[PDB]
């Protein structure tokens, strides 16, 4: 589908509210495999299970290994911009 930009608002006591799979070392993108009900990704409205995360806050995740993506994603705070695509 089309590449989309999505805004998520996270408070500091919360995580993003997603599970991710994949990573460059596995030859698969960083994919959203779960969205937790009531947590920030669900509340933002614009993210879906099956979305590939292409970037977050301008940081490219297309070529990142699984744990690299975990570190980068967990570091983001507050108003967080995602670039995503559903294939």
């Amino acid at each position: 589908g089309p590449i989309r930009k999505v805004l998520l608002l996270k408070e500091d006591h919360e995580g993003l509210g997603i599970s991710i799979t994949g990573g460059k070392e596995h030859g698969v993108p960083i994919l959203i495999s779960e969205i937790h009900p009531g947590q920030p990704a669900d509340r933002c409205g614009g993210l879906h299970v099956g979305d590939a995360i292409l970037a977050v806050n301008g940081v490219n995740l297309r070529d990142t290994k699984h744990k690299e993506a975990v570190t980068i994603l967990s570091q983001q705070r507050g108003e967080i911009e995602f670039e995503v695509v559903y294939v």
């Binding site: 993003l16 991710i20 990573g23 994603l73």
Partner: peptide, 8 residues
């Protein structure tokens, strides 16, 4: 199963 999942 080959591919890991992390809750974040």
């Amino acid at each position: 199963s080959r591919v890991p999942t992390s809750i974040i």
